[PDB]
Paper text:
The E. coli 50S large ribosomal subunit is composed of 33 proteins (L-proteins), one 23S and one 5S rRNA. The 23S rRNA consists of six architectural domains that, stabilized by the L-proteins, define the shape of the 50S subunit with its three protuberances. Here, we present a biochemical and cryo-EM based analysis of the earliest period of 50S assembly, utilizing an in vitro reconstitution system with purified rRNA and L-protein components. Taken together, early 50S assembly occurs in a domain-wise fashion, while late 50S assembly proceeds incrementally.
In addition, we noticed that the 5S RNP (ribonucleoprotein particle), consisting of 5S rRNA, uL5, uL18, and bL25, can dock on a pre-50S particle as soon as the central region of domain II has formed. This can occur both in early (d12-CP, d126-CP) and late assembly (C-CP) and goes along with formation of domain II helices H38 (A-site finger) and H42 (GAC), as well as domain V helices H80-H88, representing additional examples for rRNA induced rRNA stabilization or folding. However, the CP remains mobile and upon rotational movement of the 5S rRNA towards the subunit interface, H84 and H38 stabilize each other. The presence of domain II apparently facilitates docking of the CP-forming 5S RNP and as a consequence, route 1-2-6 involves the possibility of CP formation either on d12, or d126 resulting in d12-CP, or d126-CP, respectively.
Residue numbers in the entry:
A (entry chain O): 2 to 117
B (entry chain F): 1 to 177
C (entry chain W): 14 to 81
The structure:
Amino acid sequence: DKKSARIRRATRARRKLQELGATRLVVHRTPRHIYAQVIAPNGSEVLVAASTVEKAIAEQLKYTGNKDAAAAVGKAVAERALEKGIKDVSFDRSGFQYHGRVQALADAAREAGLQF
Amino acid sequence: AKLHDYYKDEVVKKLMTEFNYNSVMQVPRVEKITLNMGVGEAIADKKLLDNAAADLAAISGQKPLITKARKSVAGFKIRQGYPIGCKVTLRGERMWEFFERLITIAVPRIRDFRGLSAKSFDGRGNYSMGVREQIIFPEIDYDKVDRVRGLDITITTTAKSDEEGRALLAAFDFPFR
Amino acid sequence: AKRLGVKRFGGESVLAGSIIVRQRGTKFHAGANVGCGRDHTLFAKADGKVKFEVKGPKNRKFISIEAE
RNA sequence: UGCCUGGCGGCCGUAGCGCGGUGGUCCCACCUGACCCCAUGCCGAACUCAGAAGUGAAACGCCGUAGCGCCGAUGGUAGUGUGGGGUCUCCCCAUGCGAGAGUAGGGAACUGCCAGGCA
RNA sequence: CCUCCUAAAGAGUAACGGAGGAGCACGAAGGUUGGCUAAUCCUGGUCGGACAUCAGGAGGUUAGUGCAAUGGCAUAAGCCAGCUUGACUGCGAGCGUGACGGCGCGAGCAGGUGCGAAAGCAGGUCAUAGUGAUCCGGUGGUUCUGAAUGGAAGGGCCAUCGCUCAACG
RNA sequence: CCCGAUGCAAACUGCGAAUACCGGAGAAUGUUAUCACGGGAGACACACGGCGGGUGCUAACGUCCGUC
């Protein structure tokens, strides 16, 4: 199945990066919205996140998920992480392709102060 | 959308009246058509395979894709990974054009055309059959015929069972059995 | 002859870079601070206390060394 | 703080298979077009781009259903260490540890963080 | 030399035992990143009889994993593709193996590289047989040395080649 | 060729311990009975019996393995 294929593809990289026992960044791409989260080495807690689902980001966005929305989510997550001080967590692209808006959001995070 | 709009306008209403579905798109819909070729005698040389691939490319709007043998058997003298034929998958407007042109003109112009075999289904609601002597299509010019071959057209349908497949096939008026 | 089997067990002190278990196949997989050689000979990447766990949907067995 | 939907972990079939009901508040999914970001060893199949046009059909979510999978006591049984005996090929006695299978019982799982709607 | 039992739950463990397999090979059959997942059965059809490609379903690794075999592989260790040769240089704590020389694994360090946006991986092959210690000979490099001196011969060091000694520490 | 039932398999285990091996804590006793190095040894055709086994015709008062 599509979801099964995606999760099986993602879990390999997830475990590979978890072997280091380091913080990770996971971004889920949805046709409507975009989800972002930072996961501690424990794996059962959340530190920083920001998604277009909340109304706090849709004021300047005509559509839930697009280039502008992806950039805004990148800025929001970067600012929240910097104020919280995640200190250069790792990045995982939810077992997806780094070819679409994933690249845009990654570049936005990097230029916003992310060292991943 | 040469026929997609017309299909939605015409077939959907009649089928909904037939079954009285609660959703517009619950009607079974065609997804793709598999244009395989069961020559079974291309082992002699690659020239026949190349000719068949060229014929399929001319028939459709895109180049075909060759396929290899699943397994090696001794009775049929087949090795492993041997390319025996090629197939085409149509999704979008090319599939609609192919279906419209085959239903409109190709179906009537068949000698001793006893009709499509209704029982010849896949057991779940999809139909697959091979109309031999593909020369019927004008695209295969008579002067450009090398050997007699046969087609393998399979219609991909979302039918839950065979009844929905029968209903969808009849929606195209099913010339006769 | 070839020496196979397990030579370090649960609760057994092991120094850094010490072989834990030998195996022709992979009856165990690295957990935390555990490596994996070309011959599947498990070894510890740091000093600690050995331990065996059962994890995974398929009920696999892993060897993990808890930090001292 | 109560209900619904999503992501992140443990637990790894007490979480599974099947049947019925049910879902468009938000969210999610199907999907139109792709000449544009992008891709097909052909195919918009999969990834990606612009949406609510239409729907919850299908996947998936929740409740019930113990038909079906699993564990599983208690007892008993086989087995076995220790010392002895017999009719010593094998078995028994005192003591300790005690199977497999199966029975009662269970469950249609549970658990921690945040987010959106309903309150 | 290697695979399961014999070999009696650590390892090892006799016998003129049961079954046997090998002296290979790869400059891709390796590394990196990406995508994918089968044996088998039924239904329908042009050669098709029970077994050619295809469509669907059941099936969910019972195939494949180069070797005869064992234990593993779904995050696939299998398949396809973009690049490359980290199969690099000097090393290497510690551990295991054995009577022993010796042998295997090995995190990590310094220099420069390949892949990947990065995180990260790359010091050969899913692991377990493919080997030949020993002196002698062919080649090229190296003032290292040269029986008083300048050289020469000779010696020393570096890299490759001659093997059913199948009886093969 | 395949399926249901019925028995077995040292070269089958979806299950499986008593016992022996290793690791940690612990009251008690043992002339440190444990370990490293150095000097000096002897032996290098063992028998019988119990235990679980291979071979042997499960005939053996036959033979070969590990423990006592």
